[PDB]
From Swiss-Prot, chains A, B, C, D, E:
A motif (Cys-loop) lies at residues 105-113. This is Cys-loop ligand-gated ion channel. It comes from Dickeya chrysanthemi. The keyword RNA-binding does not apply. Residues 1-194, 245-254 are periplasmic. Keywords: Cell inner membrane, Cell membrane, Ion channel, Ion transport, Ligand-gated ion channel, Membrane, Receptor, Transmembrane, Transmembrane helix, Transport. The chain crosses the membrane at residues 195-215, 224-244, 255-275, 292-307. PANTHER family: NEUROTRANSMITTER GATED ION CHANNEL. It is found in: Cell inner membrane. Homopentamer. Pfam families: Neur_chan_LBD.
Length: 307, 307, 307, 307, 307
C-alpha cells in the first residue's frame, strides 16, 4: 500500500460563477512517494522536466494519476517536474489552474458565507494500492482585504478520508474504498459595494416612496406613484443587470418586491381614501394621513422578511 | 459479435443554452468487454492510465471508439484508464465533460419540462461486430433542490436500440444496424425566481395600470396611461435583458404583449368616453366606470392563455 | 486522376453570426477512393480509428487533405476512421463541427432569406490529380418548424465545378483547376417571434402616439409629446439590445425612425397650430383636427416605403 | 542569402476589436525558395501535407519559420503543404486565421478611415541569411459593399524593408537587419447604420429639445426640460450600450454632450427669465423668444466642431 | 550555478480585467547561458527552431524551464528558437502572450495609477543551480498616447532577488532560495472619455437637480424631484452598464450616491418647508429660498472627498 504525501499551494481563488456554482483556483500540486532505489547521474537527485516525464513513464516509471474529483472539465496544466532521488523517493510537482465545483448557497447575498473546496483522489488505485499519508495546504494569501472581492477567513481546513463506491469493477474482496483528500477554504464576500451602491439608494427610493402621503391633492397623490412605480422598475432593471444571475431570490430581490409592494399598497390606499366616502370628497383625514403608519409598518414587514 | 456492458455516472448537468438547445454534462463512461486472456503481473489486473493507452493500441489492443451521437463538438476527456484482466476482460474508464444537443421546447417558460439525453454508439463497429449488452446509469445526485436551477425527477431512462442507416459503406448484406444506447433524464425548471421577481410585479404593473380610470379629469386619465405605457416598455426591457433568448414567445412574453394591449385599450376607451357625447364633456358614467369591466375582462384573456 | 466520391451528412445548422456572416455546421464527411488492392487480415475490411490513421500515413498511405474552402478557422474534428478494403478502395469517415462563412443579406429582417453554404476542395491535388467524382448530401432534418429558428426550403443543392486559379506556383502547363464541391441549403427565417414581440408593440406605440391630438389644451398636447418621445427612445434601446447586430438598418429599424418622425412632425404641427393665428389662440380648426390626417398619412407614408 | 518569394492571399478581414485595436484575417501564405536539386518520385514535384512536414524537417529539410510580427497570440494554422521540386525549389503553402494588431484611431467614428496591416519577418534568419525577394498580395474581394461592415478601398500596398535591431545576442558584425514584408489594406467604415439609427434621431431629440420655449407657463417650461434631460440620459444609454467601447469621445459621444448642454442652458435661462424681473414674473419677451437665438447659435457652435 | 542573462521585449499590454486583476502581455523572452562547447555544422552557430528543440532535449540538451510566476493559466507560446554556439553558449528565444496577475487598486477610477508586472523564476532549479545574472527589458514603445487606453510612464522597473520557500522536501542543507526576476511597468489611465462622457454630464444632472427650489408651487417642487430621482436612477444604470465592474465604490460611484443624497435631502427640505409652520400655509418663504444654500452646501460636502 503505497503511502503518498500531498502538498497543495493555493495562489489565487477567483472568478466565481454563481450560476454554475463554480470558482477558479490556481496553484501547485506536490506528490511524494518512495519507490525502488535508483542510480542517478553523479548521485544528487535527478530532475526531469515536462516533456521528459512521459519518456520516463514509457520506460516503466510508476507515476499515478491523481484526479481532482470536483473539477469542471480538465485543468490547464502548467509546468510538470519529476524529482528522482537515488534512495528511491519520487516527487511529482506541477502547477495547475482549474475550475472547481462546490455546493454554493447565495440566498443571503451580498452577505454570503462561502467555502472553496478541493477534492483529490487517485484515479485507478484503491485505498489498498495507493494511500494518502498526510497533506498540508499553504494558502499564501494575506493583506489588502478591501481590494479583493473575497475575504479568506480561516486557514485551510484539511481532511483525508476513505470513499466507498457501491458499483465498480468485477472485483469482490475489498478493493472499493479509495482514499480522498478534502481541502476547505472559508471565505466571506466583500459587501462594501453592494451596501453603498445598492442597499443605500434602494433604501432612499423606498423611503421617498412614503413621501407620497405628504401630497395635498388626490390627483397629485395618485399620478406621482405611477412615476414612483416607474422608478422601482427602473431600479429593478439596474439591479438585475449588474447583480449575478441566480435561480432564486436574494435579500435585495426581496427588498425590490417589498418596494413594489409598498407602492401598490399606496395605490390601493390612495384610491380608497378618495372614493370611499360619505359625501364625495371625504378623503379619510386620518387614512390619507397614515404618513407614519406604514413607514414603520414597513419597518415591521422589513424585520419579518429577515425572519 | 462483441458484447459490451456500459455504465454512465452523471456528476453534473449544468449550463443550458436555450438558443442552441444545448446542455453540459460531466461524468464518467465505463465500457467493458472480454478479450483473449493476457498474462498480467502476478495475476491481478493490469492498470494502464492515459498516455500509455495509445501505446498499447499500437501494439494491437482493440479499443473501440464509442461516439457520443448528440454531442456538440468534441467532449473534454479527462483521465483515461484501461484495466486489463488475465481472464481476458477489458474495462475502459474515462471522465468526460461535453456539450450535448437535444430538442428543447421552451414555450411554457418558466414552467419547462425538459429532458437531457445522451446517445452512445460505436463509431465504426456495427451490431454484428460490436453490440451493446446492457447499460445502467448512475445519477448520484440528490437533496437541496431549492438551490439548484433544475429539479431532476426520476432516476434515469435507459434504452439500447438498433439504428439502421440507409446510406453507408460499400456494404449491402447487413452491416448497417449500429447499436445505440440512449439515456434520458427528466427535469423541471425551478420557477421560484421567475414567479416572484418577474410574474408577481408584472401583475401589479398590469393591475395598477387599470387604476387609471379612478382619475377624475380626462387629461389626468389619458396622460397617465402614457406614463403607464412607458412603464410596460421599461418592464418589457427589464424582462428581455435577464430572461433566456429564444426564437419564440413565452408565457412571460405573452403577458407583456397583454400589457401593451390593456393600456392601448384604455387609451381608446378614455378618448372614447370623453368624445362619445351629445355635448362634449359627457363622460359616460358607465364607460368611465369600466373600472370593473376590463380588469376582470383581462381575466378572460388570462383564462384563454390557459385554454 | 483519382476519382473521389464524397458524402456530407448535416446534423445541425445553428449559431448564425449576423455581423461576421457566419454559421456553425455539425456533421460528417465521408470520402471514398480506390487505390491499389491491399492484403487485409483474412479478407475482412480493415478499420483504422483516430490515432492509428497517422501511423498508416507515415507508412505511405495516401490520404488527401480535403479543405473546407469557406470555413473560418479550422473545424473541430471528432472521430476519424480509415476503412481499407482488400479490393483497394479506401473510405475516410470523420465527424466535424465548423464555423462557415457566406454572403448574408439581413436587410429585410426579420424576413430574411439565407442560404447556408459548404465548399469542399482538395488542398494540394489539382483536377488532373484529384477530381470530385460525385457528391450526395444528407440533411436528415424535417419537422418542428415553429420550434426552430429557421425553415429549411430545399433538401440540398449541389454543384461540382472546376475552380481556375490564375496566380499560383512557377508551374505553367495546366495545373490550376482544382475541383470543388459546393453544397447549398436554402432557409427562411420564422418571423413570427419578431412580429408579435417587436413589430406589434412598436405599432401600438406609434398608434397611441397619434392619440396626442385628442388632447384639449396646448400645454397638454406638447408636454405629452415629450413623454411620447421618451417612450420611443426607451423602445429603441429595448430593440437594439435584443435584436441582432448589423451594419445596416432593418425593417424594424425603419419603424423606429418612423416613430421618431411622426412625433417630431407632430411637435412641429402642435407648435404651429398654437402660434399660427389671427389673434393669439386661433388654433386652426382643421389642423388641430389632424386626428385623422396623418394617421392615414403615416399609413400612406408607411405603404409607400414598402415600394 | 536565400531569395524568398512570398504570396499572401486575403480571404476575409473581420472582427475589429476597438479597445484592443485588433482585427482578424483569414488567408494563405505561399513561400518559395530554391534549394539543392532533389531526386523526386517519377520526376514531377513532390507533395507533402500537414503531419508529414515535421517528419521531413526531422530528416534535415530546411523550412524557415516566418513570423507574423503584428499577430496577437499565435494564428490558427489550417492545412500545411510542402511542394518539393526536383530542380531544387521548395514551395511552402499554408492557410491561416490570425488576430492582428495595428494602431487604430476611431476618433471620427462612425466615419473612420482604417488600414489593416500584416507584417511578415523570419524568426531566426537575418537579411544576409534569408532575404525576401518579392511579394504580391491578392485581395480576392469584390462587390456588395452595402452588405459588408467595412469597405475595402485600395487594392493592397506592399513594402519589403530592412528592420534593424540594436539589442540582440552578443553578436557584432552586421547580423541585425532582418528583411520584413509589410502588407497594408485600406478600408472605410459603412456609416449607414449609425447615421440613420443614431445621428438622426439624436438630432431630432436635440432639435425638439428647443421646442421647450414655445411653452406658455414657467412651470411648464422648466418641468418639461426635466423630461427632456431624462431623454438624453436614456439616449446616452442606448448609444453607449450599442456603440463600440473606446477610451475617447466620438462624434456621436460629442453630440450627446451637446444635448446635455442645450438642455442645461435652457434650464438656466428659464430660471433666469423668470426671476430677472420688475415684479416677479417678468419674463423678458425677447429672452423667452430665444426660440431662434441658440438654435442657430447651436449651428454656429456646431460648425466650430468642424473647425 | 549557471549564470543566466535574460531579456524581455514588451510589445503590447492590453485587456485589463478589473475583477480578476489581470492584463495580457505580448512579447519575447531571451535567455542565455554558457554550456559545454559544441561542434556546430560548419563552425558558425547552429539554429534550432520550434519542433526540433525537443529533439535536442532528448539527446541531453539542458534547457531549463523558466516559469512566469504571476501568470494566470499557461501562456500562448509562439515561435521557439535555440541558438547553439560552438564556444558553448546557448540562447533561447521565444515569443509569448500571457495573462498576468497583480494587485490592482481601482478605487480612484477613472484616475488610476497602475503597474503591470512580470515575474520570472526557474521552475526546477534553485539559486545554487541557476542564477539570474542580469536582465534588461525593452519597451520599444513611444508616441500616440491619446489613442491608447493606458499611458505608459517609466521605461520599466527591475528587481532581481532571491525567494525563500520554507516548506519543501525532507531537504535541510540550503536548496530553497530560487532567484526571481520582477519586471514592473508603470502606467496611468486615460481619463478623457470618463471625464467628458461620465463626470461632466453627471455634474450637470446634479447641478440642475438644485433647480427644484426655483419652482413656485409646493406640488411642483415636490413632484419634479421624483422625475429628478428617476433620472439619477436612469443615470446610475448607464454608469454601471458601461463602467468596469469592481467590488468597491469609485469616485463616479460616489458621484451617483452624492446625487441620490442631494435629491433625498431636497425632498425632506421641501416637505419640511411646507409643514413646519405657525399658521398652516407658512411655506417658509426663506427655506424654499435655499436655492443657494445647499448648492454650496453640496460643494462643502464635495470638497471633503479631496481631503
Amino acid at each position: 500500500p503505497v503511502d503518498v504525501s500531498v502538498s497543495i499551494f493555493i495562489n489565487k481563488i477567483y472568478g466565481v460563477n454563481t450560476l454554475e456554482q463554480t470558482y477558479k483556483v490556481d496553484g501547485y500540486i506536490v506528490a511524494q512517494w518512495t519507490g525502488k532505489p535508483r542510480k542517478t547521474p553523479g548521485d544528487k537527485p535527478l530532475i526531469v522536466e515536462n516533456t521528459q516525464i512521459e519518456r520516463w513513464i514509457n520506460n516503466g516509471l510508476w507515476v499515478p494519476a491523481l484526479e481532482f474529483i470536483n473539477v469542471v472539465g480538465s485543468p490547464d496544466t502548467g509546468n510538470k517536474r519529476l524529482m528522482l532521488f537515488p534512495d528511491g523517493r519520487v516527487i511529482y510537482n506541477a502547477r495547475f489552474l482549474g475550475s472547481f465545483s462546490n455546493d454554493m448557497d447565495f440566498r443571503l447575498f451580498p452577505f454570503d458565507r462561502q467555502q472553496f473546496v478541493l477534492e483529490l483522489e487517485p484515479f485507478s488505485y484503491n485505498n489498498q494500492q495507493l494511500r494518502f499519508s498526510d497533506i498540508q495546504v499553504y494558502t499564501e494569501n494575506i493583506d489588502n482585504e478591501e481590494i479583493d472581492e473575497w475575504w479568506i477567513r480561516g486557514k485551510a481546513s484539511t481532511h483525508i478520508s476513505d470513499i466507498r463506491y457501491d458499483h465498480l469493477s468485477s472485483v469482490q474482496p475489498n478493493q472499493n474504498e479509495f482514499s480522498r483528500i478534502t481541502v476547505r477554504i472559508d471565505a466571506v464576500r466583500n459587501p462594501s459595494y453592494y451596501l453603498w451602491s445598492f442597499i443605500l439608494p434602494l433604501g432612499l427610493i423606498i423611503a421617498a416612496s412614503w413621501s407620497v402621503f405628504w401630497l395635498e391633492s388626490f390627483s397629485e397623490r395618485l399620478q406621482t406613484s405611477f412615476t414612483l412605480m416607474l422608478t422601482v422598475v427602473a431600479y429593478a432593471f439596474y439591479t438585475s443587470n449588474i447583480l449575478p444571475r441566480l435561480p432564486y431570490t436574494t435579500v435585495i430581490d426581496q427588498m425590490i418586491i417589498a418596494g413594489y409592494g409598498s407602492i401598490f399598497a399606496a395605490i390601493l390606499l390612495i384610491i380608497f381614501a378618495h372614493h370611499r366616502q360619505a359625501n364625495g370628497v371625504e378623503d379619510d383625514l386620518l387614512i390619507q394621513r397614515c404618513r407614519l403608519a406604514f413607514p414603520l409598518g414597513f419597518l415591521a414587514i422589513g424585520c419579518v422578511l429577515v425572519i
